[PDB]
Amino acid sequence: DQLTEEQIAEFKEAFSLFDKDGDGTITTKELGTVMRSLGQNPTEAELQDMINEVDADGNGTIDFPEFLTMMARKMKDTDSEEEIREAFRVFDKDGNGYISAAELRHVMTNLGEKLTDEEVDEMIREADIDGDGQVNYEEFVQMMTA
Amino acid sequence: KRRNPAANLIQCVWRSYAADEKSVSIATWKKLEDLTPPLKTVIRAIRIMKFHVAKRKFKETL
Ligand SMILES: [Mg+2]
Ligand SMILES: [Mg+2]
Ligand SMILES: [Mg+2]
């Protein structure tokens, strides 16, 4: 799956909502303005962290080329597939490749940026599609890798 | 142990996936409705950036 000319025009559109001063760069101040305009309340350490991990050139800001590679890659690259897969094995203590839906719903509503009951309900419905209480995280990763 | 970083990375994967154009979800846009198409791309760009932060935080626990 590759990128069409239309979605590039939509990617520039969204890029220009971050780059509100129109100089072709996104700073932590521009990004923080968009996020807090969407109800978020991030700290600059988080704002600086969000810019750094997508700052390919390392110049401190996000230009449209970096923004374009970020939106087209999604979580489909090899580094992301291996890392997302390794993140699921941390809870696959049986070593078989399966994680109980009750356990996964429990950890996702108690650790990290915990999902709420509405969010986790939609996730378990797609993690345990057949409804047997078990999650094939290898098939679940490739589902969201696409 | 990498329990919390792995949990946070999985959380960013779902929120990014649930927000994607070919996906359907109402709990990933809780209290966010009738959104402009560029507005949805902006939220998708934010959640993708959160994912790369989570992946870097989880990798550094190795
Ligand atoms: Mg700018
Ligand atoms: Mg840059
Ligand atoms: Mg199942």
- Experimental technique used? X-ray
B interface residues, A as partner, C-beta within 8 Å = 1-18, 20, 25-28, 30-32, 37-39, 41-46, 48-53, 55-56, 58-59
Chain-chain contact of A144 with B2 (C-beta, under 8 angstroms): no
A98 is in an annotated binding site: yes
Taking the mean position of all CA atoms in its chain, how far away is CA A104?
Answer: 18
Residues of A numbered 74-103 whose beta carbons fall under 8 angstroms of chain B's beta carbons: which are they?
A: 74-75, 79-80, 83-84, 86-88, 90-91
Contacts of B8 (CB under 8 A, 6+ apart): A111, A112, A113, B54, B57, B58
Taking the mean position of all CA atoms in its chain, how far away is CA A86?
Answer: 16
Quickly tell me which residue has 């709990």 as its tokens: B27
Final resolution, Å: 2.6
Q: Which residues of A109-120 are buried (b: 16+ CB within 10 A; e: fewer)?
A: bebbeebeeebb
Residue A95 token pair: 């070593």
A63 is in an annotated binding site: no
